[PDB]
């Protein structure tokens, strides 16, 4: 489910929206009057459920931040379906009440709590371990090599993710990623571990998490990040979420 | 409720019947369900039932662990099912995703436990400033009945509206 | 015990609503920690030398407070619920920024009930 | 300045370093109604008080129902019509009342099941 949506059973929805289903039947001439419109609802005539979907769309309901407003959708079964970050159901009748429910009580304009201004819907429990395992990077040092030492290169992040789907690399296996943006990697503010300086003018700066190739002859500046597909996946998920929302709006 | 081909399945190919959240155990601190499920699996494969009096630790340290692990190994040995007792991580085994066929990354505890089937709102609305929603959810008979009960105590409660235009006072019909 | 306290807390301030933009008060509370300053509206100008770094009736952000820490800002006068010229209502400037909306608190907000819930709920 | 006319075109003459698989996500955003969520926040950026914005929308929605009673309550909701009209008044383009339908419905009588 989306954050702003909820699922209602047919048995509960038809009682909550009975007045609107009756009006929809009369408006579209499927029922002659009020008395006939009740019999079709009583007899479970299949045209009732088509009307119920129409009148429910765009009509929020109140569920009792203990009480919030959601956009209901019809679901299979007999239970009320709520999104994991959340019994009385109220249907606003007047347009003044419907405006308030949609514009003031929906679950996306109240993302901050009034106490100190903290976010309300932070991922928890199984959501949180999934991110933790995803962003727990490669094993290091004596946990990575049995002996003291006295990795694939990917042109772009999509090739690295594609190699992971083909089971060529693991989720936490280290890799080098060609980076064609600015240096925006959160890392310890440390000088290079080692600088390899060729006599022709090119020098490689090896940091703990990235490699930078520069020259004293050209203006080149190439960046390679030592990361995992887990870190790439987390970065891509947020970036594609931002890009997807912008394109859709 | 999932079809059997969508469920995770064991190294013998059998899909599981239920999937419980493992995060419920450390917070609730009920480790006994972990012992029971492992021993239940061993009993089913060995065609055995177990009736164990509580506090078996009085015999020796880790008495329950010795009983469960030894019975798991015997079930694994007798039925030639090495996944039942993994020396690397006793009680847990690698299982597969029914949707994809890929194994899950970490070993998962599996077993056969015994499962039973069982038989301020006004303030929040005011905090949101939804005045018309609050009016709908309250509606007046509540106040008209209040006036009559106060009248029984020789008190009258009159509601007057003063017009902001011509300053004329109107007594509301209550 | 938490519900009984919440009911009494809401009751004592249930009538407090943001009803004016500016009560026009002159007094302010002097402060000499960061969380107790973010969102406050200044009651007086703050100077570093001859340069005004923050003006009267300007709300305090995270950038401004860090500037007061860096330089020799000894006293800051802010507008609080203690400075408003009323006990039956509060104005926008004496309350300050809304936590849930980022801007200055809007007219008509039932901030008394919000304060009552914000203290009772974590009980 | 004036030379005959020939003129100097202005260019950046300086370096500014600041200078594809979301189809499923984009289509789901429209399906769940998240587009109007961004439009509501867009409209509230032009409003000084959100409570008078709610009242004004309800007042405009009441006028729609009195004018054309039978066209609202089903696929077209009056409040959704008001919000889409106010976005179009800013010069942007939105479908009327954000109403959309499933084109893959296998004929009458069939309900999409969630």
């Amino acid at each position: 489910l989306s954050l702003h949506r909820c699922g209602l059973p047919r048995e509960i929805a038809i009682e909550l929206f009975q007045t609107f289903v009756i009006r929809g039947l009369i408006r579209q001439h499927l029922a002659s009057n009020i008395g006939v419109a009740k019999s079709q609802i009583r007899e479970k005539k299949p045209i009732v459920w088509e009307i119920l979907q129409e009148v429910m769309q765009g009509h929020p309901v109140l569920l009792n931040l203990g009480i919030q407003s959601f956009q209901p959708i019809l679901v299979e079964g007999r239970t009320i379906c709520l999104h994991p970050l959340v019994m009385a159901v109220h249907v606003p009748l007047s347009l003044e009440a419907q405006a308030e429910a949609r514009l003031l009580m929906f679950s996306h304009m109240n993302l901050l709590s009034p106490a100190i201004g903290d976010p309300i819907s932070v991922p928890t429990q199984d959501m949180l371990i999934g991110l933790y395992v995803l962003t727990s990077g490669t094993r290091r040092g004596i946990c990575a090599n049995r002996y003291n030492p006295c990795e694939p290169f990917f042109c772009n992040s999509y090739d690295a993710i594609g190699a992971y789907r083909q089971k060529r690399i693991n989720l936490d296996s280290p890799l080098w990623l060609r980076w064609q943006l600015d240096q925006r990697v959160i890392a310890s503010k440390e000088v290079p571990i080692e600088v390899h300086y060729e006599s022709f003018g090119n020098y490689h700066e090896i940091y703990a998490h990235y490699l930078i190739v520069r020259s004293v002859k050209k203006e080149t500046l190439y960046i390679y990040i030592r990361t995992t597909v887990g870190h790439i996946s987390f970065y891509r998920e947020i970036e594609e979420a931002i890009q997807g929302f912008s394109q859709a709006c | 409720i999932l079809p059997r081909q969508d469920m995770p399945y064991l190294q013998d190919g059998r899909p599981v019947d239920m999937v419980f959240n493992p995060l419920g155990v450390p917070s609730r601190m009920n480790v006994g369900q972990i012992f029971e499920c492992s021993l239940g699996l061993a009993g089913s494969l060995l065609d055995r039932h177990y009736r164990i009096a509580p506090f078996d630790e009085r015999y020796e340290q880790e008495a329950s662990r010795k009983l469960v692990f030894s019975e798991l190994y015997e079930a694994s040995k007798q039925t030639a099912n090495p996944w039942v007792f993994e020396p690397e991580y006793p009680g847990k085994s690698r299982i597969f995703d029914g949707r994809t066929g890929d194994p899950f990354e970490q070993p998962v505890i599996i077993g056969k436990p015994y499962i039973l089937k069982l038989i301020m709102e006004v303030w929040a609305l005011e905090g949101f400033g939804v005045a018309h929603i609050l009016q709908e959810m309250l509606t007046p008979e509540s106040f008209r009945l209040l006036v009559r009960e106060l009248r029984s105590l020789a008190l009258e409660l009159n509601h007057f509206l003063v017009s902001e235009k011509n300053f004329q006072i109107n007594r509301k019909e209550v | 015990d938490a519900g009984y306290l919440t009911r009494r807390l809401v009751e004592v301030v249930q009538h407090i609503v943001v009803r004016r933009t500016d009560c026009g008060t002159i007094r302010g509370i002097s402060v000499s920690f960061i969380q107790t300053l973010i969102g406050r509206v200044l009651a007086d100008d703050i100077y570093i030398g001859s340069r005004c770094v923050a003006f009267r009736n300007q709300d305090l952000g995270i950038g401004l407070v860090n500037r007061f820490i860096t330089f020799g800002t000894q006293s800051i006068s802010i507008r609080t619920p203690f400075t408003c010229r009323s006990t039956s209502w509060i104005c926008r400037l004496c309350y300050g920024r809304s936590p849930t909306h980022g801007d200055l608190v809007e007219l008509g907000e039932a901030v008394g009930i919000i304060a009552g819930q914000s203290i009772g709920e974590p009980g | 300045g004036i030379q005959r006319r020939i003129w100097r075109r202005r260019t950046l003459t300086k370096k500014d370093d600041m200078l594809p698989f979301v189809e499923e996500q984009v289509r789901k955003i429209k399906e769940v109604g998240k587009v109007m969520t961004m439009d509501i926040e867009r409209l509230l950026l032009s409003e000084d008080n959100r409570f008078e914005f709610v009242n004004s929308v309800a007042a405009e929605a009441t006028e729609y129902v009195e004018k054309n009673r039978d066209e609202y309550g089903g696929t077209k909701k009056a409040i959704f019509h008001v919000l889409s009209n106010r976005v179009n008044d800013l010069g942007f383009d939105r479908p009327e009342a954000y109403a959309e339908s499933d084109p893959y419905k296998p004929g009458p009588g069939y309900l999409k099941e969630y």
Binding site: - | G129, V130, H132 | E109 | -
Partner: peptide, 17 residues
């Protein structure tokens, strides 16, 4: 909240022509 602050000449006078 939303309850705050109370929420014919020129006709029949044409040219005969």
């Amino acid at each position: 909240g939303t309850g705050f602050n109370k929420g014919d000449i020129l006709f029949y006078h044409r040219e005969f022509c």
